Amino acid sequence: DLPPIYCPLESAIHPRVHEVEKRAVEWIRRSGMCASEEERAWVIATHSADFFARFAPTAADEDRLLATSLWVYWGFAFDDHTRPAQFNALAGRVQRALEAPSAEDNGDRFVPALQDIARRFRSFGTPTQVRRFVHAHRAYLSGVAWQIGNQARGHMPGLDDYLAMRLLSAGGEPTFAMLEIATGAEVPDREMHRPAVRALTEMAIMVAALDNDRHSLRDQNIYSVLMHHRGMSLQEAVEEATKLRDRILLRFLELHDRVRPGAGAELSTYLQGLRHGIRGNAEWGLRVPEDAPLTWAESPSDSSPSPLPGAPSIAWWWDDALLGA
Amino acid sequence: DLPPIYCPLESAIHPRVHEVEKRAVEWIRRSGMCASEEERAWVIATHSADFFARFAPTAADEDRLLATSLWVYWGFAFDDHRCDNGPLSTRPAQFNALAGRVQRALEAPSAEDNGDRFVPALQDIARRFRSFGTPTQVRRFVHAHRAYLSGVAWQIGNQARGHMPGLDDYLAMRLLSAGGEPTFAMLEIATGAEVPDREMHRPAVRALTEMAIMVAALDNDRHSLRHTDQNIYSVLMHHRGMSLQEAVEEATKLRDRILLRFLELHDRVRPGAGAELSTYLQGLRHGIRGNAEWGLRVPEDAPLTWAESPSDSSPSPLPGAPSIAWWWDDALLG
């Protein structure tokens, strides 16, 4: 019993989505990241071009939209897999290959593909935009390492730890750090790293992450964490999860409205990218198994302007004294 | 049987080191990082203020040299109690969770410690870094910090499996696990010189940072030689069937080659550098030298000897380490 999603945000998709999808399907087939035709079909069936065309709907350069979409395909293909000890090494190697073009594949299937993506990013993006994506990619790999860690030990994390980890393990950091690369609109340091923008970025990531949890009811996820800790039933957890998520999005809209008016063209595009991304991520979740009409919740299920109790690690999102920008 | 260190770089130490060491000893006592009197005295005996006062010897504000110095103390304590000998040293699953929690505590001032002694200490250091560094410098430190932790996770993974990495994985891993990224990312905070994104992130500058880090990491491995530990020596003894004495000569050759390429690239990049990049590059240089000099002095006033010449002066990439070959590629580092 799944309530409709609260997402009063702009929905749009690149007009050239289908041309990019074609080129991306080509690159998947040639990438070497897939053993069998059955594995390609699985990665092709993620419709990651359709996903990311919703994040950068007006990207001037079709090739930047392709490069950024390819990573999303790479991410789905990488996460369809490993013990923590081998993973920590593999995470280290893959991330080195992202940062070091002279790194060699050593027969690892994912490294050439990521290095082809990195080479496309280095031919378009500034060294600054590449370093942002690089750091986001390591943050994601740390999240995955954390989640594989918990599973191998049978640690079910409490809410604060789950939300912190899922911030990273969902792949939201690298996805949102590709907005600039797709658009070409370079956000200056003093704007991109304002705490206020950091909280907007994390809050957009968290809501996309909790919406991915919801699209997965069909084993570390907000529902398990709430059931295991708060002794809730599935329904009671579904209802509590929707309240957490809707409260976070409410904070996002509020902080966004405080921040958007003073913003430069580049930060402004980035912020419309967060919004497009949150909505795109929800809409892609509903439309992926395409053209049927979607139903959306008109109101938050919880309107509280105060921080989530039991999640101190995300409380600073609500602390305007800390975010004076 | 160890040859002297090739290190023809500026030795200098902050004229206020002794005052800063005093306030840092005070902070280590009320820090909470340390269970016993015995640990406190260990942390203190790292002389981390002397170490980092070599990295930023003209720091205008000793509060900034202090804050940065604190992380170096936190660093030794974190390695010694969580990474090298802690029940976590062979438990990557548990270490992966700790690294997530410690990193989150550094990015999120509202995070709670969950009874981990190292977190409130880190959060205090973070609060200082935020009080006078720009949010850009704080993020460069925070990113460098997760990089360091990823390296330790890789190291601890290898220890659990009894896996001795090869030269390529070892140099890539050690680039991170030896804590040089966050060490060097504190130069800006210590000095107040905000290096613009366009300059800091130039591949040439990134390569100098990595080479400054590799060299300091291999001087650390040299410092730790005075079988099963992952270091350049067991790496070479295992993968290339060498005696310890052959590994030692081999390690010295590779390290000196990297230092020469650092020196060559430094000389091509320094002339055009703006004032903030120039300060950062003097830091890399002061750091390399500071790391080695601190390592021969840490039990310290006696005359040291240095190698007048490198052990190998080949101007091309290390054999068997393609992950660093791009440091020699002047086209990619335009």
Residue numbers in the entry:
A (entry chain B): 7 to 87, 96 to 232, 241 to 311, 324 to 359
B (entry chain A): 7 to 232, 239 to 311, 324 to 358
Sentences from the paper on this structure:
One representative variant of each group was subjected to crystal structure analysis, and Cα rmsd values in the range of 0.35–0.68 Å compared to the parental SvS-A2 structure indicated that none of the variants had significant conformational rearrangements. A Trp156Tyr exchange (Group III) results in a highly active and diterpene specific SvS-A2 variant. The variant’s specificity for the formation of the diterpene spiroviolene over the formation of sesquiterpenes hedycaryol and farnesol can be expressed as the ratio of apparent second order rate constants and increases ca. 2.3-fold from 38.4 ± 13.7 in SvS-A2 to 88.1 ± 29.8 in the Trp156Tyr variant of SvS-A2. The exchanged position is located directly opposite of Trp79 and the introduction of Tyr may allow for additional cation-π interactions in 2, while yielding sufficient space to accommodate the bulky diterpene intermediate between Trp79 and Trp82. Alternatively, the introduced hydroxyl group may allow hydrogen bonding with residues in the adjacent effector motif. The Trp156Tyr exchange slightly reduces the melting temperature of SvS-A2 (from 71.3 ± 0.0 °C to 67.7 ± 0.1 °C) and more so of SvS-WT (from 58.2 ± 0.1 °C to 45.2 ± 0.3 °C).
Spiroviolene synthase (SvS) from Streptomyces violens was first described by Rabe et al. and represents a bacterial class I diterpene cyclase that we were not able to produce in sufficient quantities for crystallization due to protein instability. Terpene cyclases such as SvS form a variety of complex multicyclic compounds with potent biological activities via carbocationic, electrophilic cyclization cascades of relatively simple substrates, either by metal-ion assisted release of an allylic pyrophosphate (class I mechanism) or by protonation of an oxirane/ene-functionality (class II mechanism). We previously reported a hypothetical ancestor of SvS—SvS-A2 26—which shares 77% sequence identity with the extant enzyme.
